[PDB]
């Protein structure tokens with residue numbers, strides 16, 4: 001709740017260029033968990049390398065979608081239960097596409113990584129903790145989709 | 148069932164040189180999930196790098212075994228319950244050797260990858276879907292081995 | 295000269311979002327030649343991983359500079375001797391920063407890679423050849439900087 | 442129990458320089474499962490590359506802690522129930538820090554890898570089996586922490 | 589000359605399945621020098637990942653060609669000057685395709701690697717030395733192509 | 736010369752545990768230039784992966800040798816011509832073992848990387864510059880070995 005400001009202020013920097021920042025998050029994600037790459041299947045084809053995904057307009061569009069859902073979480077940072085229904089169904093989608101629930105922890109690490117690299121000295125441990133708890137709440141809501 | 152032909156016709160190309168095609172599938176598998184490499188323990192030793200596994204006659208023999216089980220699935224594409232018992236026990240084996248059930252999804256992605264690269268324009272989305280469902284059925288049967 | 299049109303038409307697609315396309319080229323470059331990463335030294339620090347470079351405003355600014363020099367080459371596709379002086383000095387710069395001349399061949403491969411992935415079916419072998427020869431001419435001019 | 446000697450004798454070599462050997466185990470671990478790297482969060486920061494973790498005094502200190510817990514397992518090789526309580530709580534810790542139980546299988550593979558490379562011809566299949574069963578017992582005790 | 593037998597006897601094992609062994613050599617080559625991958629340009633396209641090259645009939649055909657040139661070197665192990673002309677022109681080819689002379693040292697390391705993994709205990713240091721000198725002589729002849 | 740103190744003070748931290756710091760430098764080196772790994776040939780065998788080199792007592796011994804030569808450069812920071820003869824012959828050695836002169840630039844980047852990670856805030860750009868120039872002088876002397 002004091003850290004709701006910490007979320008708000010830190011997100012301001014990154015929301016100004018969501019694709020550039022989102023591309024950091026996804027490049028980091030594939031570096032940590034390369035087995036996620038085949039799950040982005042567009043026009044019946046699999047990306048061979050992570051740099052392949054960055055040439056795909058559909059993949060970059062998904063980066064934008066991801067950033068908009070995080071942006072919705074920031075907007076509702078003070079009460080995330082308003083998004084529970086939407087997030088539950090987003091979890092069910094991703095379950096359908098083949099994402100394991102556990103892969104969302106790597107996503108969280110990739111989000112925290114992108115924030116640390118963007119904010120530098122401004123990524124205080126209280127900012128880390130706040131984002132950890134906001135992201136934790138998002139994934140909690142999403143996890144409902146897996147049962 | 149119409150796609151049983153799609154399975155049959157597409158497999159014809161790859162079954163003519165099963166080791167060459169199987170080597171693609173396994174090179175792709177280790178690229179996506181490097182932590183599978185230590186599970187192939189022959190003569191009490193661990194492969195250091197994926198290219199090490201390709202020099203091992205026992206490892207290449209396992210590639211041939213893998214291709215023969217897929218070949219059996221194609222032969223019984225129209226009724227896979229004939230193989231359920233064999234596949235259940237194959238799952239129990241792999242559980243014993245240390246493979247997590249979830250790793251079989253990466254195997255599926257590696258199989259679809261090898262088929263896409265071998266068939267090129269001939270890997271139609273209906274062919275993708277058919278193989279996804281055949282492979283899904285194989286792993287369903289195998290998953291019984293984990294309980 | 296007929297292929298000067300091939301250059302012009304193919305570049306139109308990519309010049310509309312130069313950073314997005316340039317990010318493909320650089321991600322590919324570091325995947326092929328990871329030893330280039332330490333040469334981008336901003337504020338006395340070295341990037342640890344390729345995804346680190348994508349969070350750096352200075353690094354992304356260099357991507358934009360790269361795309362503008364290629365854009366100048368396209369503008370002068372019909373007579374590149376107008377840029378020889380500028381390109382010679384750009385080569386001398388890069389020599390100073392520690393880039394080996396030979397690394398520019400990997401850059402060429404990364405440029406052709408980004409074009410192939412962006413143009414798909416539109417990247418005809420005549421388009422490949424044209425870009426190979428335009429890029430070859432740019433590097434020829436730049437190579438003067440190394441003596 | 443005869444292999445309790447096999448454990449004892451084989452550990453003697455490695456316990457003389459625990460950090461050097463532990464560094465092998467961890468370099469191998471990150472090579473197999475790169476997604477573990479962000480879990481070592483010291484001073485609110487994430488390591489970008491595995492070589493980053495090797496410059497961290499806190500990370501090297503954790504290597505030493507790891508080796509001391511294995512050393513305790515060797516000391517109690519003949520009766521591991523004396524360590525059950527300590528190990529259960531160590532599991533609960535690691536659960537808290539974000540380690541999935543399943544990641545401990547990769548740790549086991551990394552431990553067996555380091556032992557094979559250190560012992561060479563001396564890593565007999567009976568030595569492999571003994572360490573597999575000792576490590577299996579340690580993780581069994583630790584797994585209690587996850588429920 | 590005594591080691592001409594060492595060459596002959598050691599090559600016998602590998603020449604029985606040249607593609608399988610050649611695939612080890614090339615997988616190792618791309619692992620050491622990933623920047624070689626774009627040089628294999630078939631039908632105007634670049635392989636994204638090393639596992640892509642293993643699905644390409646043209647790439648596997650080149651593996652077979654490579655093994656046949658080494659096989660010719662073994663046949664003329666006692667007098668390599670008979671192949672100088674052929675090898676000089678093979679060097680000129682490869683120069684044309686964009687291979688740097690220096691990359692042939694990595695090839696040598698990949699050849700020695702494949703031999704070590706295939707021969708195991710049979711890869712004696714005298715066998716290593718013999719192959720080093722045979723390969724050195726082949727590349728010496730090839731190096732003429734670069735001037 | 737004022738920066739001779741900058742060299743001296745910064746080296747003090749790292750010389751207290753030369754193997755630990757040297758292991759960072761070499762892990763970084765293989766991450767940037769994997770093709771260097773086969774050049775460390777001990778007992779006629781090639782390391783498959785970088786983590787293999789860290790289990791080798793001979794390889795770790797070479798890390799110690801490397802650190803002692805740098806330590807000699809620091810001791811003679813105020814007049815490096817005293818070491819020219821020794822360094823020239825060290826260059827001739829390395830030429831013999833198969834190291835290309837150009838690979839020593841990657842070594843320099845790996846040394847600067849290890850220093851940055853060890854010194855953190857203490858690695859000022861004047862400290863970077865000083866080490867760049869000291870290392871540059873060492874390699875200049877070594878380069879004599881290549882002609």
Ligand code: HEM
Pocket residue numbers: 036039040041058062065066067069070093094097099103104107
């Ligand atoms: C584990 C990493 C992830 C993977 C592999 C993944 C994959 C996918 C796939 C396959 C689709 C369907 C195809 C498409 O619409 O592009 C999709 C859609 C979508 N994703 Fe992701 N995703 C990941 C993480 C996320 C995250 C973290 C968010 C935001 C919090 C997100 C937001 C969205 C949205 C908004 C859609 C479109 C929604 C719809 O059609 O109902 N994704 N994702």
Ligand code: HEM
Pocket residue numbers: 183186187188205209212213214216217240241244246250251254
């Ligand atoms: C996740 C990837 C896989 C791994 C790590 C793996 C590993 C192993 C291991 C350790 C063995 C025992 C040693 C040996 O016989 O070589 C084995 C045996 C075998 N595997 Fe796999 N395997 C994988 C996937 C597959 C697949 C997908 C198939 C076919 C659908 C398959 C078919 C076989 C067969 C037929 C045997 C011998 C059967 C027996 O002894 O009862 N394997 N595998």
Ligand code: HEM
Pocket residue numbers: 330333334335352356359360361363364387388391393397398401
């Ligand atoms: C081998 C890959 C390359 C590397 C490692 C590299 C590195 C650098 C570095 C260190 C600088 C100085 C710092 C900076 O201004 O950001 C720089 C500047 C610059 N680069 Fe690159 N570069 C590469 C390729 C290119 C290419 C292919 C182009 C365009 C054809 C290009 C265009 C520029 C421009 C326009 C500048 C600023 C010019 C100036 O200050 O005079 N670079 N590059």
Ligand code: HEM
Pocket residue numbers: 477480481482499503506507508510511534535538540544545548
């Ligand atoms: C999966 C690989 C592992 C990861 C990611 C991991 C991570 C961590 C983390 C984050 C901490 C807390 C911060 C710290 O104290 O450094 C920790 C502490 C610790 N770890 Fe590990 N660890 C792993 C494996 C192990 C193993 C295998 C052992 C020994 C069997 C071990 C022994 C310890 C000990 C003794 C502590 C301090 C205990 C305490 O504070 O109560 N760790 N580890």
Ligand code: HEM
Pocket residue numbers: 624627628629646650653654655657658681682685687691692695
């Ligand atoms: C550095 C690694 C190498 C690369 C990147 C490479 C690449 C190529 C390329 C691009 C071609 C032309 C396209 C083709 O015919 O497939 C080729 C042809 C060929 N290569 Fe290689 N090559 C390498 C090593 C070798 C080696 C070591 C040998 C045997 C000693 C070899 C034997 C051949 C032969 C016999 C041909 C066909 C000859 C001709 O058309 O005149 N290559 N290679």
Ligand code: HEM
Pocket residue numbers: 771774775776793797800801802804805828829832834838839842
């Ligand atoms: C490019 C990275 C390097 C590689 C691949 C490399 C490789 C080798 C090899 C193969 C040997 C012979 C076998 C052995 O004695 O272990 C050696 C010896 C040695 N190296 Fe390195 N080396 C590298 C960098 C360095 C550096 C930077 C230094 C110190 C500045 C150094 C200092 C030494 C010393 C003192 C010896 C023993 C000297 C002798 O026998 O005359 N090495 N190195």
